[PDB]
Write a protein that binds this ligand. Structure first.
Ligand SMILES: Nc1nc2c(ncn2[C@H]2C[C@H](O)[C@@H](COP(=O)(O)O)O2)c(=O)[nH]1
Ligand SMILES: Nc1nc2c(ncn2[C@H]2C[C@H](O)[C@@H](COP(=O)(O)O)O2)c(=O)[nH]1
Lengths: 112, 112
């Protein structure tokens, strides 16, 4: 049930909010891996990306659209990287579905 | 206009195909960065994730759903990572929208 992102959502836990709508939240990462590192999280509290269903189709695309328009607002026109980690081999820590958005520096390959 | 993925789509260029529907293609990466590394590409030839529009909403979520169900089929229950690179700071090479899917080994942090 409750995660760290429960506390960011309900506002009890201080977070840097860049965007909010009825479907999702967008806030900065407290451990930034790039000059701009923010998280695009839904409001329906889907734990992992592998635990998503057809009912979440329109919502996942929306999370992607929100991420790229938030990438623009923060002046990432020279490029950025979106990352969704699953389970332990994915190195997932918070078990609320979120899209990482990283830019303002050159991301390398492999991506971990 | 034409990209490498034009040649994989129209089938002139040999590719390892794991899935195909009317909306997208799913094929292995020729330069695998993990024991399982495949690409989830749409059929509507959107160049970058930052050049996507509201009309592509349902299609982006579908690409994500296809990626996670293809993650299951290839036995990634211990975890995996999805990656969408944009522009040059993203280190994008093919300018057709695609979701990288990597697993079957432990992905590290940062993701590049
Ligand atoms: N802004 C903020 N981010 C957090 C907090 N706790 C964890 N995070 C971030 C750090 C990670 O980059 C991210 C979880 O990523 P993942 O390992 O994919 O679940 O959430 C917090 O209190 N504030
Ligand atoms: N399977 C296959 N993959 C290719 C070929 N050419 C390029 N790729 C892959 C390698 C990269 O991992 C990916 C492009 O990633 P990106 O840099 O994000 O655009 O496409 C090919 O001929 N066959």
């Amino acid at each position: 049930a409750p995660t760290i992102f429960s506390r960011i959502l309900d506002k009890s836990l201080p977070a840097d909010i860049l965007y909010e709508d009825q479907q999702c939240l967008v806030f900065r990462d407290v451990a930034p891996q790039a000059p701009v590192h923010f998280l695009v999280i839904p409001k329906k509290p889907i734990p992992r990306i592998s635990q998503a269903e057809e009912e979440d189709q329109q919502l996942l695309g929306h999370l992607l659209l929100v991420a790229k328009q938030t990438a623009k607002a923060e002046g990432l026109g020279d490029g950025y990287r979106l990352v969704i980690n699953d389970g332990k081999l994915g190195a997932q820590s918070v078990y609320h579905l979120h899209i990482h958005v990283l830019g303002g520096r050159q991301l390398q390959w492999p991506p971990g």
